[PDB]
Write a protein that binds this DNA or RNA. Structure first.
Ligand SMILES: [Zn+2]
Ligand SMILES: [Zn+2]
Ligand SMILES: [Zn+2]
Ligand SMILES: [Zn+2]
Lengths: 1291, 680
RNA sequence: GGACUUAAUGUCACGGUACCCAAUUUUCUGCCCCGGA
RNA sequence: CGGGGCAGAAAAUUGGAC
């Protein structure tokens, strides 16, 4: 008779359940499921407190199981005293059933006994079992028990026995995944406790027979698991969150009052990222300010929240709080605001299923197993580390629904997608995910398996379950406790090629390069070969990649781990069991073993040297290796690249509108985040490009919905019923160290279509990476392909790769103006040979090029008559105005059957155009990145100096200017609507009726929706709700003599301009009695000599700082660029070709200084190609001149049909463009009068100051005073002179 | 609002068109989805509001929703339960509404009552009989007795009458109404007036009409439930009712889907058990003539044979179906469409050659086995050709199952070392069925053909040990043969060539003396035989051995494939490919547990590849029941090569396989062989 | 020392991967002439 | 006798499948 007190310690999180009476336990499914957990009971009605305990019956069950195993391992003996088989059966008659009714196998052995166990004598097994006692199924005095187990209580030894459940436990949800499809079902939830603070339980055990003490102690020392975690057994506030929620409600009310509600996700969940910065950013107010007038620009930080602005704000609230911390403050503010907004804004198949407990007659059996005598048992341990080669993600649910103790409704789900962490904000790998991945890989390696069933009257006997019943793992935590980053994701509408409705969400991911502990234990007779195959598959070494997939989002390449530093040891349970008991099997001391020398290992633990290498196991060669195949390639980009990032752009202090994407990478060495970020292109874009290309190729993108569809896309890329069979990864820049300035500053602006001046609130800039044709960027990535693909699918993938190589799909944003254009693709040499052979087969063969008959420089043959007023005056006497207005319409044709982007129609062409540009007058393309480039802002302050646009020291022309010029020309030709206009403006004299938008005609207003109809210009070039069908690229420099070298005081490659400022709309409209004339155009001349000669004392104390100095380009320079189009009709292509080159003696205008005769260029077409997409997979070819002339004639026919006249007959008429009035008027504006030997140099100048000018010459009195009064020039005469080209103002 | 009435009127067209059976289920599911989604959005838009008249429509559409969500399940759907459970909550709130209209309240109570009836049909613990009784009484109180226009009132009245509520005041209008089928009239006649003639006539008409109703229909469920209720009351009509229903079911089942198919409705096992019980009970009488008794026993054997023929499968398996070019593309799709349409029909509108059992060669004895689940009893029917007699007996199988499970569990861990439990299993088999060793049941010195049942298919019936001090084996005095069903026996005349074939594919050179003998055929692929190499024998040889592995499939019997040097030939492929093995003798190397999966229940209807070989035209197969060493297989192959005119039991007996007391390993290694096929 | 808090000849819950589907993108020329105490 | 404008606007922030 003795009383021993024992304590129990946990090393992993364990599980908790609510306590119910045995009679009432049948009503609750969760209580029936959790019958082997720890129990929790409330203390008072309507309470949130209580205390937890562990029943002694469960400990008794574990102890007797350990006794059975120990006796089995020693052939039914212990310390030389034999034991018998015991008893585990009862009769329904003459008695009653026990309360738990075992459902597993029982280890048995040979009796080897001579005396039947009775009340006078019994073996230690029959003493530990309450066989011959005075206590039965009813507890009466507790004294009759020969051996008694008491309840185990939590050690609240410190203080505050009033313990709350919210401070000990937390909620989580698990699920079951189907092997064949990859989807899940029948989830369930449980409770998880904290082992670091509440992990000790104390209880008492009473024993009254001295014939089983040693066996009981050994069994106590042999128990390894309890309540779902590894265990050891030894023998001795409201104010904060309330105020912040009130402030969040105040901010929501203010946002709704200001009519900015969808913007709330630009404040909330976007200021949450400040947890990665620290308090320094707010303590110094280094936020990127807003300029917007250089006085009080908001840049997100000036709001109307019923007080001061949002800048006289949390800088005064962090000081107020200073308690929860920066991280908690930002996180709680963001979460509260997001939840409030989601609440403000916003069928079947839930199927939460718990395994039932069966009850039927004849459903209980006793199955004994007798192992052979002489067999040996061992115990193997595997230790190592798991390294993340890619960002990972383990999913959880919203914390508002994970409160342990609490909980007419339909589906409504969030969009935040949190990640799993512990109470100290460290990263965690749960045991359930590792066990699931291991089971899946084991079933794959074996070749056969079973789908897990939950009823379980008899346990399964398949190949996988037998091995899985011997495998033990551990929970893993890291040493990194820093906030994670956020990935954004959208979807595209296949129709308009724009962002679709309800298509935004975000996920949280961890860094790449972290390491986690790894433990695995196996107990049995022989170490399997499938487990070795799985371990070798997971390991990485000498050019091999680890192939461990963990967690979710495997389709976008998230969570590929690698196993390293593997060590394998081995116990011997037939002669070294005392050492195993004494050392407790190294439970909870595995890192020491990972970092221990060979000589320091304790007795019984020896290294294992029989671990097979690769290529010698039959598995992993027929099952595991061909599972996933790797394809690697490099992409060369010869254009600036910009994958936009908004939150970073509005958070970092650079004060830039848009910046590039980058990520954080963890470094194993020195255990720190590498402070140099890495630029990359996200795997989501990589997947989307391939999916869209394949869908458009095979024509499955046009289907309305894919609920139960099984199209080709649903087979290759998966759908909501089955997972995807292709997995993508990231494209990372690899040659970033070869650039002296990796990023370039580029500016953009929008030009009004009426006054030729920059529009209001239309200025913006980008910060892309720097790429040039002679120095391109390099990106390297990969993707994986599953086995079982047919030849057609491989052909489709190869065709998609070839399409990407050719340049059909640019990367990033702003691809219509020359960004992200691909130059070539270089496949690696380790890809499968058949893939390379297919790439060679599908490579574009020799095109059907014309044998130099009519495939040379295509030059138009057309002569415009030109204006006759300057033709009859070769003495240069008349004076003309720099600009005139063009009037047409108003009758705009609109189309409703607009062409979608999701199909290559058979009767529509798609190709590319190559052209050259030649300059006639000096060209100026300013570079606004540096305002002091010539380095002359010293002795002369306030004088801006630019140079010519260049990337890596190569002169270029941006595609935006070319796109704008040709778009304006096409709009003028096709009498489309005004794309850019200043709707609101007022006019004053030295008080009008309406604004400038009221005088504009109704039909000429810009298109605002896809229902009314799209004019040809908007239908061809694009709108905010409709992506355009043409693309333009950058132009490079090929040859040319030099810059415009002069001889003065400044550098010879520079010039000083004059005064140009403030276009005045209130000049063509005298007072409220006239409508707008229309588009404004300039004229070609040679007035740039006046600036050149008046230089050198154009600067001598006449213009202090109103002028600028910039480099110039000389005549005879050549540039070359490309133009792309797809799904084009015939007359559309004809009009495009005609506008790209109207003919001879007609040119365009481009650059700065147009009213001074600067920037006149001519464009000629070098060639033209067109690829045809049919069932036979046709290739590209060069068209002859005849079909091009047919295209132009068809365009003329369409235009003359649009004219509406019926008197003029239609047919095969040679193209005379002077017949149409507005076309002739437009072409009169672009006539070059100094090209041939017909110099006829005119004189075009703005009117000079009245009497005190500098260049004013006596005579005609051309100043504004004479032509500014209604005595010498009536208003109607002024309007007529303005709306008539080449009209002299000399008289 | 003025929007609410127009929206309800527009959305009611789609919900009232749901009573049109013309539309296919694939479109019915989407139209009802749209008709439900137009209404459910109003809930999340107008939370805590509505006119309380469109509130009942949410529950009414939800009732019809659980018509297409029922399939794609194995044994019980988890969404059919959820649909009614959710529709109850969306009608409880409509009940609490204070509109106060008469017709609206009547319709709401009608919908609630029918939903509760369905819930009680599919779930009892969540809806007891008392609650249903009270709800139906309340529905009757409001005046839900419009029998002339709506069958829902008829269903409510029948359900109330079946519970014990007297309904004499509505019987006349219940009978008169034309919207009542035959079963409802039979129930009204039996449960109200206690009449028998009208009930017999009406349910006879119903059973006769049942011949043209697929097994997916609910009418089968109602019929079996009514027959079970009649049996519970100790009536007399059930004995004939069960037999007639079984006849109708057997006639209807003959649709010939790939020659072996079913649907797996919940019933069709209790129905067969009830028919068996009724026939046995009516045969237990002391009729003055014995010919009627012989006819009754022959009918019992006929019922057993009709049950044992085919096997059933579930939708998860019959969808994930390996395909061929001839049958899988057409017959499977037609069967699937027919079954689905039949399932979604009654919920919308209510309105070789088989031989002879007595054709056996002289000197043969046939034994038929049947395991009754309704009463937990065993049966054994024998027929003697010479004496022209039939007998039957009974036994208990509640501990034989446990002994077999113990043997299987020990064998799965210690293959050879589990030979001690085999002796115990054989002794238990001998003790449980003592009529095998009785001269009055099976005369000594004859041939025995076994036709076992579900879990008896895996027992070595030829190695039983008699229950005495020095009991002997069964095969010592007899010579046994096996057959999965009597329907697999066909007339066959031995007209074949005299060539031998070999097909070897293994991992190690365990067969070195083999593959080098002179007598092997020239079409042998001994060096890595492939799947299409088997299809190159077309001369009807006499012997053929295939030494290779096997792959086991746990759910689809059609997916188990024979392991070769290729992707493998499966059950469907072996039925659709091999055409040149008619009338020959086949020998397999060593596999009987590498193909069939382990079993957990008392039943199993899985088939091996030996039945596939029997289906293509082979006259007999010889295989090993469990894994043995290659020495015995090679010795048997050489013995079969040397001669074919000697029996197999003689070889087993002369090799000392009857020494189970001395060396259990010898018994284990020797009694593993058995012969499949009936020599006609 | 004890209830709140177990029942004893029978607890495979280490019997279940929060799992599947979606391109931060569409559109826009770093341009320029009359004035008002 | 005198004089600088613009340094972004407009939309999509979740839908389903179980
Ligand atoms: Zn004992
Ligand atoms: Zn299994
Ligand atoms: Zn599809
Ligand atoms: Zn337009």
């Amino acid at each position: 008779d003795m009383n021993i007190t024992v304590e129990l310690t946990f090393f992993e999180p364990y599980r908790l359940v609510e306590w119910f009476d045995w009679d009432a336990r049948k009503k609750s499914h969760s209580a029936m499921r959790g019958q082997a957990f720890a129990q929790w009971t409330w203390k008072g009605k309507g309470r949130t407190a209580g205390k937890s305990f562990i029943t002694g019956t469960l400990v008794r069950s574990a102890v007797i199981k350990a006794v059975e195993e120990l006796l089995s391992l020693n052939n039914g003996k212990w310390e030389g005293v034999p034991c018998c088989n015991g008893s585990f059966q009862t009769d329904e008659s003459k008695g009653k059933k026990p309360s738990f009714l075992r459902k597993r196998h029982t280890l048995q052995w040979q009796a080897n006994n001579k005396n039947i166990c009775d009340k006078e004598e019994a073996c230690p097994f029959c003493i530990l079992l309450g066989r011959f006692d005075n206590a039965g199924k009813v507890h009466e005095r507790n004294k009759d028990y020969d051996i008694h187990f008491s309840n185990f209580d939590l050690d609240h030894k410190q203080e505050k026995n009033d313990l709350r459940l919210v401070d000990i436990a937390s909620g989580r949800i698990l699920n079951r995944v189907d092997f064949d499809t990859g989807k899940a079902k029948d989830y369930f939830r449980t409770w998880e406790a904290d082992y670091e603070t509440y992990g000790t339980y104390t209880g008492r055990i009473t024993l009254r027979n001295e014939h089983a003490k040693k066996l009981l102690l050994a069994s106590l020392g042999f128990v390894d698991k309890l309540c779902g975690a590894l265990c050891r057994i030894e023998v001795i506030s409201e104010d904060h969150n309330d105020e912040l929620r009130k402030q969040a409600e105040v901010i929501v009310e203010a946002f709704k009052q200001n009519d900015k509600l969808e913007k709330i996700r630009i404040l909330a969940d976007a200021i949450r990222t400040l947890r990665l910065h620290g308090e320094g950013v707010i303590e110094k107010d280094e936020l990127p300010d807003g300029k917007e007038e250089r006085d009080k620009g908001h840049h997100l930080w000036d709001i109307k929240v019923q007080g001061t602005a949002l800048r006289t704000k949390l800088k005064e609230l962090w000081q107020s709080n200073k308690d929860i911390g920066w991280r908690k403050f930002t996180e709680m503010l963001g979460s509260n605001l997001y939840l409030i907004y989601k609440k403000e804004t916003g069928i079947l198949g839930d199927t939460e299923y718990y395994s039932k407990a069966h009850d039927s007659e004849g459903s209980d059996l006793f199955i004994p197993v007798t192992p052979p005598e002489g067999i040996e048992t061992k115990e193997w341990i595997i230790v190592g580390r798991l390294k993340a080669a890619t960002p990972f993600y383990f999913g959880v649910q919203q914390p508002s629904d994970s409160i342990p103790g609490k909980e007419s409704l339909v589906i409504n789900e969030h969009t935040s997608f949190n990640i799993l962490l512990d109470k100290e904000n460290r990263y965690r790998i749960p045991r359930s995910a590792l066990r699931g991945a291991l089971r899946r890989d084991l079933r794959t390696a074996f070749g056969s398996g079973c789908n897990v069933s939950l009823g379980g009257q008899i346990l399964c006997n398949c190949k996988v379950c037998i091995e899985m019943r011997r495998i033990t793992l551990k929970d893993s935590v890291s040493d990194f406790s820093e906030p994670p980053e956020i990935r954004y994701r959208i979807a595209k509408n296949p129709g308009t090629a724009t962002v679709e409705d309800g298509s935004l969400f975000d996920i949280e991911v961890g860094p790449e390069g972290l390491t986690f502990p790894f433990v695995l234990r196996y107990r049995g007779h022989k170490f399997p070969e499938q487990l070795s195959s799985v371990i070798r598959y997971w390991e990485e070494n000498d050019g091999k990649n680890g192939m461990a997939w963990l967690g979710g989002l495997d389709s976008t390449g998230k969570g590929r781990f690698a196993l390293k530093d593997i060590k394998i040891f081995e116990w011997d349970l037939n002669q070294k069991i005392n050492e195993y008991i004494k050392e407790r099997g190294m439970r909870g001391k595995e890192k020491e073993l990972l970092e221990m020398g060979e000589s320091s290992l304790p007795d019984g633990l020896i290294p294992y040297k029989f671990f097979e290498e690769r290529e010698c196991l039959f598995p992993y060669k027929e099952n595991l290796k061909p599972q996933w195949s790797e394809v690697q390639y490099t992409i060369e980009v010869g254009s600036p690249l910009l994958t936009a990032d908004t939150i970073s752009a509005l958070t970092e202090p650079g004060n830039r509108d848009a910046i590039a994407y980058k990520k954080r990478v963890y470094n194993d060495g020195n255990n720190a985040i590498e402070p140099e970020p890495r630029f990359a292109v996200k795997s989501e874009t990589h997947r989307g490009i391939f999916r869209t290309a394949v869908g458009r190729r095979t024509g499955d993108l046009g289907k309305e919905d894919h609920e139960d569809c099984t199209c080709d896309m649903c087979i290759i890329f998966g759908n909501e019923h089955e997972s995807s069979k292709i997995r993508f990864e990231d494209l990372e820049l690899i040659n970033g160290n070869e650039f002296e300035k990796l990023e370039k500053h580029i500016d953009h602006v929008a030009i009004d279509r009426f006054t030729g001046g920059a529009l209001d609130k239309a200025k913006f800039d980008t910060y892309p990476l720097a790429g040039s044709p002679k120095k391109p960027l390099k990106l390297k990535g990969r993707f994986w392909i599953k086995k079982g693909f047919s030849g057609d699918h491989k052909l489709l993938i190869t065709t998609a790769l070839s399409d990407i190589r050719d340049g059909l799909y640019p990367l990033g944003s702003k691809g219509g103006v020359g960004y992200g254009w691909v130059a070539g693709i270089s496949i690696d040499d380790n890809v499968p040979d058949d893939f390379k052979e297919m790439i060679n087969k599908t490579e574009m063969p020799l095109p059907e090029e014309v044998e130099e008959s009519n495939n040379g420089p295509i030059n138009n043959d057309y002569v415009h008559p030109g204006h006759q007023s300057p033709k009859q005056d070769h003495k240069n006497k008349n004076i003309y105005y720099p600009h005139y207005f063009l009037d047409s319409g108003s009758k705009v044709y609109r189309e409703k059957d607009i062409i979608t982007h999701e199909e290559f129609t058979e009767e529509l062409l798609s190709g590319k155009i190559n052209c050259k540009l030649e300059t006639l007058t000096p060209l100026i393309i300013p570079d606004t990145s540096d305002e002091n480039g010539l380095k002359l802002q010293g002795n002369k302050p306030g004088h801006k100096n630019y140079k010519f646009f260049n990337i890596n020291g190569e002169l270029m022309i941006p595609g935006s200017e070319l796109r704008g010029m040709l778009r304006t020309h096409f709009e003028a030709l096709t009498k489309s609507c005004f794309a850019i206009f200043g709707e609101d403006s007022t006019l004053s004299w030295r008080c009008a009726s309406k604004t400038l938008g009221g005088k504009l005609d109704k039909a000429l207003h810009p298109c605002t929706g896809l229902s009314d109809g799209l004019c040809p210009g908007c239908h061809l070039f694009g709108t905010t709700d409709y992506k355009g069908r043409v693309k333009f690229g950058f132009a490079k420099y090929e040859n040319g003599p030099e810059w415009l070298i002069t001889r003065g005081n400044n550098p010879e490659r520079s010039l000083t301009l004059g005064v140009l400022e403030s276009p005045r709309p209130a000049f063509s409209i005298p007072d409220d009695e006239s409508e707008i004339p229309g588009r404004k155009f300039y004229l070609h001349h040679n007035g740039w000599r006046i600036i050149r000669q008046k230089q050198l004392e154009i600067r001598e104390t006449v213009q202090p700082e109103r002028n600028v100095t910039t480099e110039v380009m000389d005549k005879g320079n050549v540039f070359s660029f490309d133009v792309r189009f797809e799904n084009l009709r015939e007359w559309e292509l004809g009009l495009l070709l005609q506008s790209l080159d109207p003919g001879k003696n007609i040119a365009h205008k481009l650059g700065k200084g147009k009213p001074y005769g600067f920037g006149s260029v001519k464009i000629k077409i070098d060639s033209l190609h067109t690829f045809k997409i049919n069932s036979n997979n046709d290739k590209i070819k060069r068209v002859p001149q005849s079909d091009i002339r047919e295209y132009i004639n068809k365009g003329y026919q369409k235009l003359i049909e649009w004219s509406g006249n019926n008197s003029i007959q239609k047919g095969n008429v040679l193209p005379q463009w002077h017949v149409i009035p507005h076309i002739d008027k437009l072409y009169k504006l672009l006539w070059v009068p100094f090209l041939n030997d017909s110099k006829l140099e005119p004189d075009v100048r703005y009117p000079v100051l009245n009497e005190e000018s500098k260049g004013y010459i006596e005579g005609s009195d051309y100043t504004y005073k004479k032509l500014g009064d209604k005595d010498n020039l009536p208003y109607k005469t002024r309007v007529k002179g303005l709306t008539t080209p080449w009209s002299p103002w000399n008289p | 609002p003025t929007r609410e009435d127009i929206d309800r009127k527009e959305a009611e067209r789609l919900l009232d068109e749901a009573f049109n059976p013309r539309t296919k289920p694939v479109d019915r599911k989407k139209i009802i989805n749209s008709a439900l989604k137009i209404l459910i959005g109003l809930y999340k838009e107008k939370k805590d509001d509505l006119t309380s008249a469109s509130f009942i429509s949410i529950a009414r559409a939800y009732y019809l929703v659980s018509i297409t969500i029922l399939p794609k399940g194995t044994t019980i759907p988890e969404k059919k339960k959820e649909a009614l459970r959710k529709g109850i909550e969306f009608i409880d709130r409509a009940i609490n509404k204070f509109n106060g209209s008469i017709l609206d309240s009547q319709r709401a109570f009608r919908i609630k009552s029918v939903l509760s009836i369905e819930f009680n049909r599919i779930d009892r613990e969540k809806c007891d009989n008392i609650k249903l009784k009270n709800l139906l009484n309340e529905a009757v109180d409001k005046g839900c007795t419009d029998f002339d226009t709506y069958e829902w009132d008829i269903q409510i009245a029948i359900r109330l009458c079946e519970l014990g509520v007297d309904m004499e005041g509505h019987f006349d209008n219940l009978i008169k109404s034309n919207k009542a089928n035959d079963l409802q009239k039979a129930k009204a006649y039996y449960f109200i007036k206690k009449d028998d003639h009208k009930a017999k006539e009406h349910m006879d008409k119903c059973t006769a009409s049942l011949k043209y109703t697929p097994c997916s229909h609910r009418l089968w469920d109602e019929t079996v439930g009514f027959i079970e209720r009649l049996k519970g009351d100790s009536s007399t009509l059930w004995r004939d009712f069960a037999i007639k229903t079984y006849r109708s079911c057997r006639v209807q089942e003959k649709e010939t889907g790939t020659l072996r198919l079913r649907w797996y409705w919940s019933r069709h096992r209790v129905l067969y058990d009830m028919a068996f019980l009724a026939v046995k009970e009516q045969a237990d009488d002391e009729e003055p003539d014995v010919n009627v008794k012989q006819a009754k026993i022959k009918k019992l054997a006929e019922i057993s044979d009709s049950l044992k023929s085919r096997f059933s499968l579930r939708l998860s398996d019959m969808e994930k179906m390996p395909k061929s070019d001839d049958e899988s593309n057409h017959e499977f799709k037609k069967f699937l469409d027919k079954c689905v349409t039949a399932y979604q029909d009654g919920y919308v509108i209510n309105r070789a050659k088989l031989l002879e059992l007595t054709q056996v060669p002289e000197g043969w004895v046939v034994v038929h086995f049947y395991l009754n689940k309704l009463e937990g009893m065993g049966n054994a029917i024998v027929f003697d050709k010479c004496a022209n007699s039939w007998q039957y007996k009974e036994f208990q199988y509640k501990e034989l199952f446990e002994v077999f499970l113990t043997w299987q569990a020990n064998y799965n861990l210690y293959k050879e070392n589990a030979a001690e439990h085999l002796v115990t299993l054989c002794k238990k088999i001998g003790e449980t069925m003592p009529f095998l060793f009785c001269d009055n049941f099976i005369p000594n010195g004859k041939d025995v053909l076994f036709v076992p049942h579900d879990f008896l298919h895996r027992l070595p019936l030829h190695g039983s040990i008699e229950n005495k001090t020095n009991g002997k084996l069964f095969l010592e005095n007899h010579s046994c043969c096996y057959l999965p069903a009597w329907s697999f026996a066909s007339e066959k005349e031995a007209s074949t060539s005299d060539e031998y074939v070999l097909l070897k594919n293994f991992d190690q050179g365990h067969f070195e003396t083999l593959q080098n003998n002179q007598i092997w055929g020239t079409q042998s692929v001994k060096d890595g035989a492939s799947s299409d190499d088997l299809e190159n024998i077309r001369n009807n040889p006499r012997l053929l051995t295939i030494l290779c592995h096997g792959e086991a499939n746990m759910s689809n019997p059609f997916r188990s494939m024979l392991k070769l040097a290729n992707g493998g030939i499966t059950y469907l492929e072996i039925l659709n490919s091999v055409k040149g093995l008619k009338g020959s003798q086949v020998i397999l190397g060593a596999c009987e547990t590498d193909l069939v999966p382990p079993l957990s229940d008392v039943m199993d209807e899985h088939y091996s590849v030996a039945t596939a070989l029997l289906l293509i035209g082979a006259a007999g197969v010889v295989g090993t029941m469990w894994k043995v060493r290659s020495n015995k297989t090679k010795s048997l192959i050489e013995w079969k090569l040397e001669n074919i005119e000697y029996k197999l039991n003689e070889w087993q007996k002369e090799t000392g396989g009857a020494a189970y007391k001395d060396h259990p390993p010898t018994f284990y290694r020797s009694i593993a062989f058995r012969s499949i096929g009936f020599p006609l």
